[PDB]
Structures are given as structure tokens and as C-alpha cells.
Amino acid sequence: MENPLQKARILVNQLEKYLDRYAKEYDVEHLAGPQGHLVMHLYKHPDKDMSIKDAEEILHISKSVASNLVKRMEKNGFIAIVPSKTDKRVKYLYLTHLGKQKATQFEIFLEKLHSTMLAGITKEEIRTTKKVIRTLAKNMAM
Amino acid sequence: MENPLQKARILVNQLEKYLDRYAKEYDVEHLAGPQGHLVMHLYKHPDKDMSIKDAEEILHISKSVASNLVKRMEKNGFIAIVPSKTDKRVKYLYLTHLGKQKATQFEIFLEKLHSTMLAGITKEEIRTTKKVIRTLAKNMAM
Numbered sequence: 044m045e046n047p048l049q050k051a052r053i054l055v056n057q058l059e060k061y062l063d064r065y066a067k068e069y070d071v072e073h074l075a076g077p078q079g080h081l082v083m084h085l086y087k088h089p090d091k092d093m094s095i096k097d098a099e100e101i102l103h104i105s106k107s108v109a110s111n112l113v114k115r116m117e118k119n120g121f122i123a124i125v126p127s128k129t130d131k132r133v134k135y136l137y138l139t140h141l142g143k144q145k146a147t148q149f150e151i152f153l154e155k156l157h158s159t160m161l162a163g164i165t166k167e168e169i170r171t172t173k174k175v176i177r178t179l180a181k182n183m184a185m
Numbered sequence: 186m187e188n189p190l191q192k193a194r195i196l197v198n199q200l201e202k203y204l205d206r207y208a209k210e211y212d213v214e215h216l217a218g219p220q221g222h223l224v225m226h227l228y229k230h231p232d233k234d235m236s237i238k239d240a241e242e243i244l245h246i247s248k249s250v251a252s253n254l255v256k257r258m259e260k261n262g263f264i265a266i267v268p269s270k271t272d273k274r275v276k277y278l279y280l281t282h283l284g285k286q287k288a289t290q291f292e293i294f295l296e297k298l299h300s301t302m303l304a305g306i307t308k309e310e311i312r313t314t315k316k317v318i319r320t321l322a323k324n325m326a327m
């Protein structure tokens with residue numbers, strides 16, 4: 044008589060469009076997913092080294108994905124990839140000047156995005172919503 | 186650092202898979218969307234006539250969609266389409282014996298689907314979830 048599926052897909056689509064437009068305004072296109080995670084990780088932990096191997100573990104991705112991801116981040120100019128001097132088979136990642144800028148813009152983006160999105164919704168309402176979604180998922184799992 | 190989009194798409198996909206499997210078990214494949222709405226409408230109001238024109242208005246669809254929908258329902262054997270005797274340009278819809286069976290199975294399906302899906306979730310929790318979803322949508326609408 045009525046369909047919450049189509050309703051739900053329309054909403055997720057809207058959310059994606061919203062997110063994309065918002066990211067463009069903050070000039071952090073590309074950072075929405077795993078690029079942004081890695082940029083923010085590198086940005087928050089600049090004392091420490093990160094090999095591609097480390098990035099695999101931190102993002103929980105495969106060798107081929109991590110490989111593609113970092114090559115694209117290098118293309119973007121967000122990171123440098125420099126082989127270990129001692130063992131030129133270990134590859135270390137360095138967040139560039141541009142990568143640091145991208146990180147600072149991403150943080151602002153995230154702050155403003157949540158303020159806009161979550162206006163007039165309480166921490167409790169969120170907790171409730173999260174419990175419901177999560178009970179639904181469980182109820183379906185056969 | 187994390188993505189509720191992909192999370193949300195995975196959940197809707199799961200829900201669609203759940204729904205499909207559930208519908209097959211109740212033998213009401215095809216009825217999930219507009220076919221089922223029309224079958225249930227016809228089933229609940231058998232005193233009254235429904236032209237294709239009426240079905241357009243009741244489902245809020247276009248002439249070409251309604252046309253395709255009813256031809257498919259006729260293929261399925263859920264309805265007969267009989268032109269008005271007086272004016273063979275008005276087309277009336279009749280829910281067949283099989284269409285009535287489909288309707289009764291659909292009602293049971295819907296009852297069991299909601300019981301399973303909504304186990305351990307209160308009317309209040311639902312109302313809260315619905316308010317949140319709805320505030321989100323509003324917050325995004327530019």
C-alpha cells in the first residue's frame with residue numbers, strides 16, 4: 044500500500060547529494076571516505092611513521108585497495124610515498140603541505156556538516172534512532 | 186574517518202533482500218509495490234468500480250505507467266480488464282479469483298513481516314526514529 048524501501052533509497056540519495064555539495068563548498072572533495080580517514084590519521088599522529096602495510100591495517104583494506112588508494116592520494120598531492128632507505132620494499136607515507144591544508148579544511152567541514160545536519164535533534168533521539176536501526180538489522184539477520 | 190552512507194546503503198540492501206525472501210515464502214512476489222496496493226484496494230472495496238483512470242488517481246501514477254502496471258497485473262491473472270459496454274474507451278478492472286487469493290496471502294505476509302521486523306521496538310521508539318529521519322531530511326533540504 045506504500046513503500047519505505049523506495050522512501051529510504053530516496054533519502055540516502057538525497058543525503059549523498061547533500062554531502063557532495065557540502066564537501067565541494069569546503070574544497071574537500073575526495074576526502075569524504077578512506078582518503079579523508081588516512082589524511083586525518085596522518086594529520087593527528089605526525090610523530091609516527093605509517094607504511095602502506097600500516098595503512099592496510101588502519102583502514103582494514105586489502106593490499107590492492109590500499110595500493111590504489113595511496114597512489115591516488117599521491118596523485119592528488121596529499122601524500123608523498125618514500126621507500127625505506129634501509130629496505131626499499133617498505134613504503135612510508137608522509138602528509139604533504141597540501142595534505143595538511145586538506146586536513147584542516149576537512150575538520151571544519153565535518154564540524155559544520157554535523158551542526159547543519161543534526162540541528163534540532165537531541166543526543167537521546169540519536170541514541171534511540173541508533174537502537175532502532177540496530178534492532179531492525181538484527182531482526183532481519185537470518 | 187567512517188561512513189554512515191555506505192552503512193545506510195548496506196542496510197537498505199539487506200532490507201530489500203529480507204523483504205524479497207519473505208515475499209517469496211508467502212507466495213506474494215510482485216505484490217510488494219503498486220501491484221499489491223491495487224490488489225488490496227480492489228480487495229477491500231469490491232462493491233465499487235475502478236477504471237484505469239481511477240487507478241491512476243488512486244496510485245498517483247501517469248497514464249503510461251498505470252497502463253503498463255494493469256497489463257502486467259492482467260498477465261499475472263490478478264485482474265481482468267473489461268471495456269465499458271456503453272463506452273468501450275473506459276476500461277474497468279476486476280480482481281479475479283486468483284487476485285483475491287493473492288490479496289489474502291498478502292495481508293498475512295504483511296502481518297508476519299511487521300511482527301518479525303518490529304520485534305523489540307516500541308511505538309515510541311518508532312515515533313522517535315520517524316521524527317529524527319524527518320528532521321534530517323528537512324535540515325538537508327536547501
Ligand code: HEM
Nearest residue numbers: 058062075076079153157160161169186187188189190321
Ligand atoms: C563524510 C561523512 C561523515 C564523516 C566522515 C563522519 C565522521 C564522524 C566522526 C568522526 C564523528 C565523531 C566525532 C567525535 O565525537 O569525535 C561523527 C559524529 C557523528 N556523526 Fe558523523 N560523519 C559523517 C557523516 C554523517 C552523517 C551523514 C550523519 C547522519 C546522517 C552522521 C551522524 C553523526 C552523529 C549522530 C554523530 C555523533 C555526534 C556527536 O559527536 O555527538 N554523520 N561523525
Ligand code: HEM
Nearest residue numbers: 044045046047048179200204217218221295299302303311
Ligand atoms: C512491502 C513492504 C511494506 C508494505 C507494503 C507496508 C505497508 C504497511 C501498512 C499498510 C502499514 C499500516 C498498517 C495499519 O495500521 O493499517 C504498515 C505499518 C508499518 N510499517 Fe510497513 N510496510 C512494508 C514494509 C515496512 C518496512 C520494511 C518497515 C520498516 C523497516 C515498515 C515499518 C512499518 C511501521 C513501523 C508500521 C507501523 C506499525 C503499526 O501498525 O503500529 N514497513 N506498513
Ligand SMILES: [C-]#N
Nearest residue numbers: 045046047048
Ligand atoms: C510501512 N511503511
Ligand SMILES: [C-]#N
Nearest residue numbers: 187188189190
Ligand atoms: C558519523 N558517522
